[PDB]
């Protein structure tokens, strides 16, 4: 084959292989953000349960619920860290596919170039959507934590006031 | 799975290596064709110098026409090598980012391999580049020599033609 045919053959393999790597890393990242989002919802549920139990637990039971919350936080943290690692690799996969698209363009393989660029846009949209879902969960967690603190503050103020008047 | 990702990374490093190889060959060949076209123009200028004082205006105009042709060719080879130089730059960057993907996914052997390949091809291209730069310097040398000697020959002809104008006038008292 001619030099230009050899360059086109080679760039086609580069675009196919970087497309595959981008798809795999996108799938893994989306799965990891999903698992983190589930852990955020679990913790949010725990804060809400804990809030509903305030005033209603002996000191040992309260300590035990708090330990479960500490454990649920560890799980959420570990899932967050795992997705951040995968997201780092995914960013490299996106840059590789961008460079592959430029190589395809420069060699005159325009269909490979445009298809790669469409693929990068699609996976960015997909990752943005899963991030939006995660932020919805994080908002609910923040709300739950704020309500717990607001209630705990009221509880401690009530218990002070009781202790004083009792005395 | 990390299994599927290391397989795909291995295909990325292999394919980017193949593209880097092929673009390196294409660029070396293009720099070579340009250097040959520079060498041709240099030889033509040198020949023009060697012919000063031995040509009439008709022959000299033909020499210059051939030089203009050779210069057009050199320019076309220049454009083509800069086009391949851009493609090669992109190949090098692809391989660097492949080496980074490999490192991040635990494919440490593939990462080192890619970096060594980049260094080898960079060395080779740099050397072929240096050859072209030397050729360019030789062309500039030959053009300076030719224009200096052309200016001198013009002086010589003007001296002769003035002298012979007097000598004719002298005869027709």
UniProtKB/Swiss-Prot annotation, chain B:
It comes from the Eukaryota. Residues 148-170 are annotated as: Disordered. This is Diablo IAP-binding mitochondrial protein, cleaved form. It comes from Homo sapiens (Human). The gene is DIABLO. The chain holds residues 70 to 239 of 239 of the full protein.
